[PDB]
Each structure stands twice: as structure tokens, then as C-alpha cells.
Amino acid sequence: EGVARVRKSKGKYAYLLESTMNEYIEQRKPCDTMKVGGNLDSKGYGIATPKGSSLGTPVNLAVLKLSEQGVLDKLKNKWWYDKGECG
Amino acid sequence: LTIVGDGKYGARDADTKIWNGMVGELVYGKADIAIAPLTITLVREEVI
Amino acid sequence: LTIVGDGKYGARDADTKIWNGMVGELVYGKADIAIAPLTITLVREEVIDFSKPFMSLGISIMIKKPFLDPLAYEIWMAIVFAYILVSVVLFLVSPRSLSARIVAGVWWFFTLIIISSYTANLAAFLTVERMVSPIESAEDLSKQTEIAYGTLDSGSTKEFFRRSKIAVFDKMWTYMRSAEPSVFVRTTAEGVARVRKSKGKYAYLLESTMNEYIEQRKPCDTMKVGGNLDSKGYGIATPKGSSLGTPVNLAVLKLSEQGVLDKLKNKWWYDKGECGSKEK
Amino acid sequence: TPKGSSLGTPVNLAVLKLSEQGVLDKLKNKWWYDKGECGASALSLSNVAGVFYILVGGLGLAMLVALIEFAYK
Amino acid sequence: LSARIVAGVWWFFTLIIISSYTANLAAFLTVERMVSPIESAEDL
Amino acid sequence: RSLSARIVAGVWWFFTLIIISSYTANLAAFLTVERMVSPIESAEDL
Amino acid sequence: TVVVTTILESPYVMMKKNHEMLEGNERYEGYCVDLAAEIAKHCGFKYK
Ligand SMILES: CC(C)S(=O)(=O)NC[C@H](C)c1ccc(-c2ccc([C@@H](C)CNS(=O)(=O)C(C)C)cc2)cc1
Ligand SMILES: N[C@@H](Cn1cc(F)c(=O)[nH]c1=O)C(=O)O
Ligand SMILES: N[C@@H](Cn1cc(F)c(=O)[nH]c1=O)C(=O)O
């Protein structure tokens, strides 16, 4: 809805959103949107478990395992810049 | 895999003090884990 | 505040399986907490607890930084000798005679060619500098020879290459282990000094943070090139089961959200920086 | 394969199977251009000399046209 | 005045020519490269 | 050669100088661009 | 086992750097070695 508002306001509306979605839409049809400037802050997405879960620690270890194995980067490229239509 | 009921990420209303969204589903035991673009916050790290 | 005894970050010797460095000091109870540029790894996370990371980075590549130029120095001379040689032939001819007239025609075509060449080549030269790069991508750097490249003796960069099962990084590790003379250095300063003193024959692989820092420091002769090889972050480490772990973690993300961490980063990196302005 | 081999036809089928699955191309790239160590303004100092030849030569012709010009009398 | 209009047209002509030479030479010095003569097998 | 006519020759000279310089520069840029590989040619890009 | 004959032409079949510390078909690497493995896969035979 925000991006649609950007496209239909013809420059009269700017949308503040996480860099990820911005970078994604920048690569998507009809490639009429753009990410401008740097970022306002720097944070990250994480997998959340109910505190005291028997699943917490192995999931965490799994996440950083996947990060070091290049899995996360490969997936990022898969869904962002491989399916990207203007890249 | 299940889609969060109210389609929200999560926050606490400062009146009801109830968590909504995926965080809400985690805290209140409606789901076992959340795998989504969930941004890490202070208040969320406090409850999950 | 105490400086780690052996000046190491931490790893297990593959024989003794003893932890050294700051992680070692934590595990064996010589220190209560570690606050340093400590990269979060799987194996480190297995023996200590990492707070949410307070700074993001990635392994990256550092290299040594790299009006009469369009026209060769020999030709500027040749232009002068041709100048006096034409003025001397014209001097030998002395409205005007037709032969003397054709001299001006050939000389005109000559200087036309010269100035056109200067303009074209200068156009390339100006277009080229923004466009030009010795090596942009990591794989390309790996492919290049005679430009040796290396990492620190201990740490995540070296271990990243040792563990990496991904093609290019595997090839690079296979190269580094056999490289002679040794391409590994004992301090970051040593690596950067090696970059500066190899005159482009040595590239240094180091975390983006140190790279970005040195890029801003005197004599500003080093440069970060390409993107990053991976993406990870530094975290504050506590001995697992510490009474300080959760409040320290909460404090770290508290500082991150209040803009404190960004503020400190700018304070020590780009405020004390002595020079990131690239102009195409 | 030795002709009449029990291995001939399945090996052949396997070869074209691998070709269609992109395996052969991938292997070619793996051993040729992946392990490849060479993959791929200043000034031109020599070229201008080529113009100098036409310059000096023309000057020589001019010199001649000058001499014959002063030689008509 | 005929000679003048001729000189004008020829001037525009040589202007275009040298401009084209300069531009194309600029493109040629900015991009591509030549190393080998590309000798034909029969030539070899 | 009136002075006004002289300043006319000067300004017009600067004008045509700018014009031929711009034509040369832009034509050079266009030719440099053509040397760069087309986006269409790549399959992924297509 | 099926005896495969090949030739030491780089980079089709090459001696591994540590071939001295290795034995059997682990001594060799190259295009034709990997190709031999794939052919063995799709034909279902062991090879030497
Ligand atoms: C070891 C790896 C799992 S990792 O480094 O932790 N994650 C890998 C992945 C590529 C990655 C890498 C780095 C970061 C990251 C992002 C932001 C920060 C700082 C700016 C703030 N940290 S924070 O957790 O987002 C904040 C809310 C406190 C620090 C690190 C997030 C994710
Ligand atoms: N990811 C956020 C929610 N969220 C989602 C968006 F698409 C966005 O642009 N901004 C945002 O805060 C969260 O975790 O609450
Ligand atoms: N920070 C690393 C050690 N470390 C330090 C560096 F300056 C570097 O360039 N590479 C590296 O692995 C760790 O935590 O082990």
C-alpha cells in the first residue's frame, strides 16, 4: 500500500520502510521505485522463540551455522537479486 | 507453517498490556516458534 | 580493563584443544567479561555466550591506493623538434610561394591530428578514472597472480578460509597454505604495512571495520576494494551462565536503539578521520 | 567402449543425460574458467610517429617543390 | 561569393570529419584493445 | 572592422566553439556507450 | 570392478598434489575424473 502510494502520488509521497523491502521492490515490476540515501539505523531480523523453549539454543546455533555456511547469503541472492527483474 | 492470525508483527498495547502478532502468538503459546522478518527490539527481547 | 595476556582473540589448538586469548580468559575464569572487537563464530558461541552484536562487518580486501600525461613525454619533445624543423624549412624558403604554402597544409594536418589525439585520449583518461579499477570482485582478485594476498595468523578470517567449502574461498585457502614466502601477518598494522611496502604486489584480507578505519588514517594510502566476502558482527562475550549475560545483552541492544553505538562508531571512525568521497 | 560391450548403450545415454542436465558444461567451466588464473589510460607513445613520417615526408616534398620553384629562372 | 560559400561548406564538412575522428578515437581509447594480428591459418 | 562587429565575432566564436565541442563530446560519449555490452544480450537480463 | 583407462593430460586427468599420501582413485583429479564419477552414477557401476 505504501509503495502503491509512492507510485500514485507522483513524487508527492515518500515511504519509510526497512531496507530489505526497499531493495526488493527496487528490483520488481514495473521497476518504478527507488531506494534513496543511506539507512537511518542498523538492525536485523531474527528467529524468535518463547523464552525457556527447548528449541531456542539449537535454533540459534542453526542460524549462525547457516550464516557461516553461506546459506543465508545464497538464499538472499535467490529471493532478491536472482528473481530481480531489473538487476 | 501458519500465518499470524491478526497479520501483525507484534507490540504491547499499553492499556491491555497484551501482545499482538507473532510475538503475541509466541508469548501466549499459540505457536512454537516464529520464522519471519521479525525486527529485533528491546521490548521484544524482554518477552521472547 | 585488562589486556588479554597472549594478545589473541581466541581459538582452540587442534592438538591441545585449549582456548587461548580473550575467550580463553573467559572460559578459564581469568576475566569476568570480554568487551572487544570479538567476532561471533559457531565454535565460540559453543563455549561462551554472545550478546546481540553491537557492530556489523564483513571480511574484505585492502589494497595500496591506485597534465602532460595523455601525450607521451617523448612526443612533447618530438612536437618541439618538428616545430623548429618546420620553422627552419620555412626559414629555408624565405604574397607567398606555393611550396611554402603546402608546408602549412601538412603541418596543419599534423597539429590537427595531435590535438585530436590529445582530446580523445584525455576523454578516455577522464572517463577511465571513475570507471577504472585494477580488481573489483573477490573472485577476480583470487584469479590474479603476482599480487599475493593474505590474512592474520589467528582469527575468524583465517578460519573462515580454512572452513569455507565455497569454491573461490576454498581455492584461496588452498593457495594461502602453500604460499611462499608466507602471506600471513601477526598484526593488522603489519598487514597494512606490508600492503604499503609491496607497492601493489600484496593485498590484505581483513574485516571491513579495520579496513574502513585505516582508509581514513594517515597517510591515507590504503583502500577498501570490492564488497565483503561474508557478513558478521562483533559481540560482547560472557562466560556462559554468567549473572551479567542478559543485562549486558539488553544494554547492548538498548545502546543500539538509542543511537549510542552509531554515535561511537562515527566518533572513532569518521570524526577523527583525516581524509570515501569517490568522484566519477 | 569395446564394441559389443554391456556398458556401451547405458554409458552413451548417461553422456547425453549429463549433457542435457548442464553437468558437462558445469564441469567444463569448473576446470577451465574457474581454476583459471588469468581471467579477463596513460598515453600512446608510438602511434604519433606514424604521423611524423607523413609530416617529414611532406616537408621533404615541399623542400623539393621549393628548390624547383627557385630553379625556374 | 561562390568561393566563399564553397569554403563554408567544406569547412562544415571537415569540421564534421575531424569531430567524428576525435569522438570515435575517444571511444576507441576508452574501450576495446588490440594485441594479436589475427593471422589466418593459410597466412601462417 | 567596427568594434561592435569585433565583439560579435568573439561571442559567436565562443558560441560555435561550445557547439562543436559539445557535439564532439556527446558523439564520443555515444560511441563509448555503444562499446559497452548491451543489457538485452544477456539471457538472465532478457 | 570396471577398469577405466585414461590419460594424464591436464586438466582432464591430473595427479593430486598430495597423491603420494593418497592411494587408489583418490590419486587423480580433473574433468574426466568427475565425468567418470558421473558416468558411474548414472550407469550404476564401481570403477578403477
Ligand atoms: C554471527 C552471525 C549469525 S551474525 O553476524 O550475528 N548474523 C549474520 C547476518 C549476516 C547478520 C550480520 C550482522 C548483523 C548486524 C546488524 C546490526 C548490528 C548493529 C548495528 C545493531 N545490532 S542489532 O542486533 O541489529 C540491534 C537490534 C541490537 C550488528 C550486526 C545482523 C545479521
Ligand atoms: N518488521 C517490522 C514491521 N515492519 C514491516 C515493514 F514492512 C516496514 O516497512 N516497517 C516495519 O516496521 C516488525 O518486525 O515489527
Ligand atoms: N576479530 C577476529 C580476529 N581478526 C581480527 C582482524 F583485525 C582481522 O582482520 N581478522 C580477524 O580474523 C576475531 O574475533 O577473532
d(CA A67, CA G29): 30
CB of A42 shorter than 6 A to ligand 1 = yes
Q: Are residues C154 and C225 in the same domain?
A: yes
Q: Does A60 touch chain C (CB under 8 A)?
A: yes
Cα–Cα–Cα angle for B39, B41, B43, rounded to 5 degrees: 135
Any alpha helices (H) in A1-87, and if so which ranges?
2-8, 19-26, 56-68, 71-77
Torsion of CA A64, A70, A73, A78, to 10 degrees: -130
CATH assignment at residue C13 = 3.40.190.10
Resolution for the entry shown, Å:
3.9
Q: How many CB atoms lie within 10 A of CB B4?
A: 19
Contacts of C159 (CB under 8 A, 6+ apart): C11, C41
Cα C162 off chain centre by:
21
Q: Are residues C241 and C176 in the same domain?
A: no
Q: Are residues C268 and C215 in the same domain?
A: no
Q: What are phi and psi of C114, to 5 degrees?
A: -60, -55
C130: in domain: no
Q: Are residues C200 and C251 in the same domain?
A: no
C77: in domain: no
Burial letters for C18-30: b for 16+ Cβ neighbours within 10 Å, e otherwise? Answer: ebbbbbbbbbeee
d(CA C218, CA C272): 11
How much distance in Å is there from the Cα of C20 to the middle of ligand 1? 25
Experimental method: X-ray
Q: Are residues C214 and C183 in the same domain?
A: yes
> How many domains does the structure of chain C reveal?
2
d(CA F5, CA F11): 10
When computed from its CA atoms, the radius of gyration of chain A, rounded to whole angstroms, is 17
How much distance in Å is there from the Cα of C155 to the middle of ligand 3? 5
d(CA D49, CA D56): 10
C74: in domain: no
Torsion of CA C269, C159, C174, A81, to 10 degrees: -60
Phi-psi region of C164 (alpha: psi -120 to 50; beta: other; left: phi over 0): beta
Helix axes C73-93, D49-70, angle to 10 degrees: 10
Dig out the grid coordinates for D65 from the structure.
617543390
Give C184-250 as a DSSP string: -BSSHHHHHHHHHHTTTSEEEEEEHHHHHHHHTSTT--EEEES--SS-EEE--EEETT-TTHHHHHH
Say which amino acid occupies C62: M
Q: Comparing C-alpha atoms, which of C146, C157, C150 is closest to residue C9?
A: C157
Q: Are residues C218 and C257 in the same domain?
A: no
C81: in domain: no
Subunits that touch chain E (at least 3 Cβ pairs < 8 angstroms)? Answer: C, D, F
Q: Decide: helix, strand or coil at residue D26.
A: helix
Which one of C231, C249, C267 terminates a domain? C231
C172: in domain: yes
**C59 beta partners:** C207
Q: Are residues C18 and C34 in the same domain?
A: yes
**Residues of chain D positioned with their CB less than 8 A from the CB of G35:** 18, 24, 27
CB C51 within 8 A of CB C254: no
E29–chain D nearest CA distance, Å: 8
Pairing mode of beta strands C148-150, C222-225? unpaired
| Cα end-to-end span (Å), chain D | 94
Q: Are residues C213 and C275 in the same domain?
A: no
Q: Are residues C164 and C213 in the same domain?
A: yes
Residues in chain D: 73
| Cα end-to-end span (Å), chain B | 19
Domain that holds residue C172: 58-64+136-231
Residue B48, CB-side half-sphere exposure with 13 Å CA sphere: 29
Cα–Cα–Cα angle for D64, D67, D73, rounded to 5 degrees: 140
Q: Does D20 touch chain G (CB under 8 A)?
A: no
CB of B9 shorter than 6 A to ligand 2 = yes
Chains A and D touch (3+ CB pairs under 8 A): no
Q: Comparing C-alpha atoms, which of A51, D48, A23, A37 is closest to residue B28?
A: A51
CB C52 within 8 A of CB B41: no
Helices and strands in chain A: count of H runs, count of E runs? 4, 0
Interchain pair C116, E29: CB under 8 A: no
Q: Which long-range contacts (CB under 8 A, 24 or more apart) does C263-267 make?
A: C265/C55
C220: in domain: yes
Q: Are residues C188 and C243 in the same domain?
A: no
How much distance in Å is there from the Cα of C56 to the middle of ligand 1? 6
Q: Are residues C34 and C47 in the same domain?
A: yes
C100: in domain: no
d(CA F25, CA E18): 12
Q: Comparing C-alpha atoms, which of C132, C118, C119 is closest to residue C278?
A: C132
Interchain pair F28, E27: CB under 8 A: yes
Q: Are residues C13 and C32 in the same domain?
A: yes
Q: Comparing C-alpha atoms, which of C62, C58, C67, C59 is closest to residue C221?
A: C62
CB D15 within 8 A of CB D8: no
Q: Does A39 touch chain C (CB under 8 A)?
A: no
CB C237 within 8 A of CB C39: no
C92: in domain: no
CB C53 within 8 A of CB C235: yes
Interchain pair F24, E19: CB under 8 A: yes
Q: Comparing C-alpha atoms, which of B23, B26, B25 is closest to residue B38?
A: B23
